[PDB]
Amino acid sequence: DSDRIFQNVYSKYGEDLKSSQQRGDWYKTKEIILKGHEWLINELKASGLRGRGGAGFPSGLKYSFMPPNPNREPQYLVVNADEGEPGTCKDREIIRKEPHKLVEGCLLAGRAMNATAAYIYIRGEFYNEAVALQTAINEAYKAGLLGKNACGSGYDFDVYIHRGMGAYICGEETALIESIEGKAGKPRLKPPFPAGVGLFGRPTTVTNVETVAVTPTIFRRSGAWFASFGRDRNQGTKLFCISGHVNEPCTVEESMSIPLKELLEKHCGGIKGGWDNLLGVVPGGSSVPIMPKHVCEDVLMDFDALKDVGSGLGTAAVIVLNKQTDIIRAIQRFSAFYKHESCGQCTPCREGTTYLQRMMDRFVTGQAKEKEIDLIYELSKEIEGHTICALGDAAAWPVQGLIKSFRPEMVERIKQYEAKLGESVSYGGWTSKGKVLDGKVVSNPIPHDAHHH
Amino acid sequence: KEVELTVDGVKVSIEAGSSIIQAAEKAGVTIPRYCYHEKLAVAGNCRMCLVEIERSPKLAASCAMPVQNGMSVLTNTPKIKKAREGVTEMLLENHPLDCPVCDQGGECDLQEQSLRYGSDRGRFHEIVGKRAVENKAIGPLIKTSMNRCIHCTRCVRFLNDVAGAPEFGTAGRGNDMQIGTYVERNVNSELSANVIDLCPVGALTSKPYAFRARPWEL
Amino acid sequence: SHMISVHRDTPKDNPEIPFEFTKENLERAKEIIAKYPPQYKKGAVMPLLDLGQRQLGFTSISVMNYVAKYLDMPPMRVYEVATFYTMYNRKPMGKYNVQVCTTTPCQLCGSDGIMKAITEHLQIRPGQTTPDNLFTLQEVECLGACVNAPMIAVNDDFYEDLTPERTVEILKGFQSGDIPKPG
Amino acid sequence: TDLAKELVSGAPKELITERVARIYQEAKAATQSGQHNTETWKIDWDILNKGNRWENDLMGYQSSSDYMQGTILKFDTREGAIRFAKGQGWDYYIQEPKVRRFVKKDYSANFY
Amino acid sequence: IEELHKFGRYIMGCLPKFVQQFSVWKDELVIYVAPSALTQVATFLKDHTSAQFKACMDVTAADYPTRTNRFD
Amino acid sequence: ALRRYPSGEERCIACKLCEAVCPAQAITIEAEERIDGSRRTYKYDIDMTKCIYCGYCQESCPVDAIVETPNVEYATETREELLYNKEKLLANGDKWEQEIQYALDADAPYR
Ligand SMILES: Cc1cc2nc3c(=O)[nH]c(=O)nc-3n(C[C@H](O)[C@H](O)[C@H](O)COP(=O)(O)O)c2cc1C
Ligand code: SF4
Ligand code: SF4
Ligand code: SF4
Ligand code: SF4
Ligand code: SF4
Ligand code: FES
Numbered sequence A: 001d002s003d004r005i006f007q008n009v010y011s012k013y014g015e016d017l018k019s020s021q022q023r024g025d026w027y028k029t030k031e032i033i034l035k036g037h038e039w040l041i042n043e044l045k046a047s048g049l050r051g052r053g054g055a056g057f058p059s060g061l062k063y064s065f066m067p068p069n070p071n072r073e074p075q076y077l078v079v080n081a082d083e084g085e086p087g088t089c090k091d092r093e094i095i096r097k098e099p100h101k102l103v104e105g106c107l108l109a110g111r112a113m114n115a116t117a118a119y120i121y122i123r124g125e126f127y128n129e130a131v132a133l134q135t136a137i138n139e140a141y142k143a144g145l146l147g148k149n150a151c152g153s154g155y156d157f158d159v160y161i162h163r164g165m166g167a168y169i170c171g172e173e174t175a176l177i178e179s180i181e182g183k184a185g186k187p188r189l190k191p192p193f194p195a196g197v198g199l200f201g202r203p204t205t206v207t208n209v210e211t212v213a214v215t216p217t218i219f220r221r222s223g224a225w226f227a228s229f230g231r232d233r234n235q236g237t238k239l240f241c242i243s244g245h246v247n248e249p250c251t252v253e254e255s256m257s258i259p260l261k262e263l264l265e266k267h268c269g270g271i272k273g274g275w276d277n278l279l280g281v282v283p284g285g286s287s288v289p290i291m292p293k294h295v296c297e298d299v300l301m302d303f304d305a306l307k308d309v310g311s312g313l314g315t316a317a318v319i320v321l322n323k324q325t326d327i328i329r330a331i332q333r334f335s336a337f338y339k340h341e342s343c344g345q346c347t348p349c350r351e352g353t354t355y356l357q358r359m360m361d362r363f364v365t366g367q368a369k370e371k372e373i374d375l376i377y378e379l380s381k382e383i384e385g386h387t388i389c390a391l392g393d394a395a396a397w398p399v400q401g402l403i404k405s406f407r408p409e410m411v412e413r414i415k416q417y418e419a420k421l422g423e424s425v426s427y428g429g430w431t432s433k434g435k436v437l438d439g440k441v442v443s444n445p446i447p448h449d450a451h452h453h
Numbered sequence B: 001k002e003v004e005l006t007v008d009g010v011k012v013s014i015e016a017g018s019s020i021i022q023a024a025e026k027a028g029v030t031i032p033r034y035c036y037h038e039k040l041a042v043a044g045n046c047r048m049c050l051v052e053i054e055r056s057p058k059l060a061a062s063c064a065m066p067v068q069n070g071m072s073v074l075t076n077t078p079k080i081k082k083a084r085e086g087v088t089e090m091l092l093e094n095h096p097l098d099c100p101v102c103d104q105g106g107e108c109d110l111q112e113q114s115l116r117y118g119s120d121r122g123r124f125h126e127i128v129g130k131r132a133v134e135n136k137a138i139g140p141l142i143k144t145s146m147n148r149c150i151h152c153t154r155c156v157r158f159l160n161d162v163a164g165a166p167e168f169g170t171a172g173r174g175n176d177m178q179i180g181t182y183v184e185r186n187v188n189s190e191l192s193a194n195v196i197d198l199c200p201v202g203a204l205t206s207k208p209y210a211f212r213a214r215p216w217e218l
Numbered sequence C: 001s002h003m004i005s006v007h008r009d010t011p012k013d014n015p016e017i018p019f020e021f022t023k024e025n026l027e028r029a030k031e032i033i034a035k036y037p038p039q040y041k042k043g044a045v046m047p048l049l050d051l052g053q054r055q056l057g058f059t060s061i062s063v064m065n066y067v068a069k070y071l072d073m074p075p076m077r078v079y080e081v082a083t084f085y086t087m088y089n090r091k092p093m094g095k096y097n098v099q100v101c102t103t104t105p106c107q108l109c110g111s112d113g114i115m116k117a118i119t120e121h122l123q124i125r126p127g128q129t130t131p132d133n134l135f136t137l138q139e140v141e142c143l144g145a146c147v148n149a150p151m152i153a154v155n156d157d158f159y160e161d162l163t164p165e166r167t168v169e170i171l172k173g174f175q176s177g178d179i180p181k182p183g
Numbered sequence D: 001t002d003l004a005k006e007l008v009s010g011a012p013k014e015l016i017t018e019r020v021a022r023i024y025q026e027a028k029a030a031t032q033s034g035q036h037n038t039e040t041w042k043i044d045w046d047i048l049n050k051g052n053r054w055e056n057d058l059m060g061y062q063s064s065s066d067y068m069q070g071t072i073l074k075f076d077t078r079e080g081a082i083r084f085a086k087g088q089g090w091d092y093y094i095q096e097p098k099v100r101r102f103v104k105k106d107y108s109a110n111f112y
Numbered sequence E: 001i002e003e004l005h006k007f008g009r010y011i012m013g014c015l016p017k018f019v020q021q022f023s024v025w026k027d028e029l030v031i032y033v034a035p036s037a038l039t040q041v042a043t044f045l046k047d048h049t050s051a052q053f054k055a056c057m058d059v060t061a062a063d064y065p066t067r068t069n070r071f072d
Numbered sequence F: 001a002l003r004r005y006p007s008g009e010e011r012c013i014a015c016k017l018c019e020a021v022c023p024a025q026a027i028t029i030e031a032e033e034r035i036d037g038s039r040r041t042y043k044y045d046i047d048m049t050k051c052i053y054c055g056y057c058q059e060s061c062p063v064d065a066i067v068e069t070p071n072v073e074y075a076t077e078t079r080e081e082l083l084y085n086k087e088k089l090l091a092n093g094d095k096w097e098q099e100i101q102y103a104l105d106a107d108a109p110y111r
């Protein structure tokens, strides 16, 4: 396929504006801008554009929830630009390599949403890209396109950058707004929604850097062309940060419904050992459960086709593994990640994510009992649906992923430890002789697996 | 203005913009709560007041969700009672076994709601142990045992808003979130000791009254 | 990230130690507030906190007290901000900061070996400080360099696709002052 | 009701002449947020101006000559309490419970 | 529960002038009558062949001061 | 008898459970914070002429501070001698500690 949206992902076209314009940058813009926010949104609802954050919500429909701004009051359009999920790198490439492409889309998107300003929240781990993206901001200010007189029109657009200082939780739609206002950054309950009431009391809309960076094409290029790729209503092109235990971890820009087998041969090398050696696949990101081998046989990359098999195309960070690894430790590391990153205000995830962590560490060593395997499954069901933000749902799905498809492995691990230790361990890990002497647990394997540190 | 709604078959007439829990409390249906107090700003973090609304899959924090017109609100589905026991099983995961030595003994909401709405057995025999916190010293009137805090922020919301003493807040993140004043300083408000009544658990107790009586004697 | 949320005054840190921005940092601070509306200028604690962190070297209590003074806020709303985010150092922290991702996508490329390789050279464990104050090793969660998994992070740089024999180049050089090129 | 029913109860005369009863509804406790002990009306007797409690010299007990100190009655309607007090010819006084004033509470109010 | 319900109704139909109401709890049937309906209903339950309650086991009371007639 | 830990500290933390179970109201407990901060009781009486020797206090004690020793031969000449105060009960716990252990070891699992 030709006409890649982001071709500078390998850094062969330049980041300065002069090479950006000859790449396919701003053109017919005022004519696009002065087609009205009604034409842009009517394009998007017809477009089939849906969010790249993981929700799968219509990106175009989301913009139609905002209220019109007759006096152009300060309604902001927050351009989410955090990665957060382990194994995702799509957001870094767009910011670091194609900066002006994002800035173009923000103004066009903000025009559709009656906005005035746009904040591009970027992680504090992208410190150099934060300075670099601001350098591309200066080149944008000099051109006179962004400011109180945008391209000479009566509509204005403003851009600021708000760096974060490290919190996975801030990647939420409501946590992102709070961190700007100077609070800690804990998510709010959805009512009132940011579409109505958001930053500084004014309506706001959170969109991923990937989602915004594609709008310049869709606005300029036809508009009807978008629905071509993938299946129906799961439409559009999509970046993919394929990594893991593979021949060559790399990023591509394939369409939806790309079969995994075709995706593991045409590019991204292949399995380290061959297709017969595949153990598990973590598409999208660490949030979704890890699919088995047999699911991937007809897996087609869609927001919903992966959903049918229990996983999902959240951040398209498709992970491919091999059978020479212990998935119990790999899932255990995700549990110790969501624990360490949960903001910690709702009861189910402040505590339950510690409940999972304290149990996967006994799983990875096999110091448990066979019925306790389905005990922790009942714990993960006590967390989902009870939390404010979706981090709680994202901390329980990987636990179910291990149990759903790799149940015999956990049993074999426990049966090893019975043979390895010699004495069967009761509920909670207590051996027959484990007790407390002068203030410490004695005569029992204490699992110092809480990162030690 | 008033929106007519039914909670478990009981017709409710309340002012518009009210939350579900006030509507339910007017109909006589009792919805368990920790973090909701009727003189404080609404936080929705304790997740104990969850109910089921007819047109939704997602449980509603009745202390935060504003009332609607014609809405059908359920509170006694087996789905809800499963949620109430799940949340109860989480608060007591790290709670200390302090009830005999805890001045909140006979009057603690974490006891009566756990007895009424939680399960009768605990499923936490973990070998690593519970979470332990250091007690913060905030003056001669408030005796703190922060092991017992259920992170409900009534102390924070009262002192910030009602009392006007902004030195009390939540410092930390996640499993290490520690209500307190970060640095060691005494709480300075003439109304600071009302936090002793708001704190539903033994985390904040009276220092002069410490260890002197049980509530059933008085 | 070292998770302690109660500050104890040290001989190195206390409110009695003065802190004042340099003449340059005033100009940035004056213009940092330019991104926030007049009635919400308090949103600029996160920029000023890290901006003031770099002038001193870490996020001292005097910084938090100074930052609160600048934006007309009680010192607690800054303490809540400071300890929520993991990139604020509430300790001397030394010169450099090794950040070693140990998450699963990184751990698939033998991210354990990088951890062992560093611990060998400096005689320290994760979360410790070297006897010279030049280095302070520190584990870390995902940094984004997962497709280029086995990555070390020093201060704010990037070194992806590493091995225990790749650690020999950097840990030797930084003491000598010969800093390798990041990327 | 209208009858002087106390003449058949055999109670000592002092409950009519010398003691004062109180009809009240128990108030909500500050410590706990439950609202069930405040739904039944109760009758209790005033304490005595002397001899209500005094320290036993030997073991430090709490001696008392008030034979109504541990007598609390329960009702379900306010009228039944007043009618019963009237029937016995008690010198009572009613304590009207305070009524909390309604105030709507909204999640969004923290910013608006 | 059903059989006491049937037999409880049977007594009410036989004596509508006296039986104010009847109630069933698990395996206990209660007949509520006025003081002036006592000797009649007691006699009926003693002599009627379908219900020969020759033996009276307990006579008691209970105090509910809230009600107009406290004793039950 | 009121018992001790091996270290010597009193077992009772003045929790007042036994006072609330006691069917006959034979127990009188008065407590406060000790001189060093401990939650200890300074007054503890059992009216041995009012106790029904029922074992509820023993069952309710969370720390096994109050038990009933197998002694039965303690009939007294005067009734004042049957008002056991905290000094008396702690002196019994020391006197009968060995015999209490006999019964606690045997019947620990059944409770
Ligand atoms: C715990 C958590 C972390 C998240 N992190 C990110 C992130 O790093 N980048 C992103 O674009 N969306 C992230 N999201 C999704 C956001 O909540 C937001 O809804 C999403 O960006 C929607 O934007 P879109 O529809 O334009 O794709 C996260 C959500 C949660 C619950
Ligand atoms: S679910 Fe967890 S991370 Fe999300 S708001 Fe609640 S406590 Fe914070
Ligand atoms: S706060 Fe309540 S549940 Fe916790 S120790 Fe005290 S009495 Fe027990
Ligand atoms: S200390 Fe008490 S009032 Fe404050 S959050 Fe904890 S439980 Fe709530
Ligand atoms: S054994 Fe005696 S002192 Fe103990 S509870 Fe029973 S009656 Fe009271
Ligand atoms: S039950 Fe035990 S600990 Fe509690 S007051 Fe009685 S003797 Fe003391
Ligand atoms: S009472 Fe609603 S979540 Fe706490």
Ligand code: FES
Residues within 6 Å of the ligand: A086, A087, A088, C101, C102, C103, C104, C105, C106, C141, C142, C143, C144, C145, C146, C149, C151
């Ligand atoms: S998992 Fe290590 S940088 Fe992302």
Ligand SMILES: [K+]
Residues within 6 Å of the ligand: B104, B196, B197, B198, B199, B200, B201, B202, B203, B204, B205
């Ligand atoms: K309290």
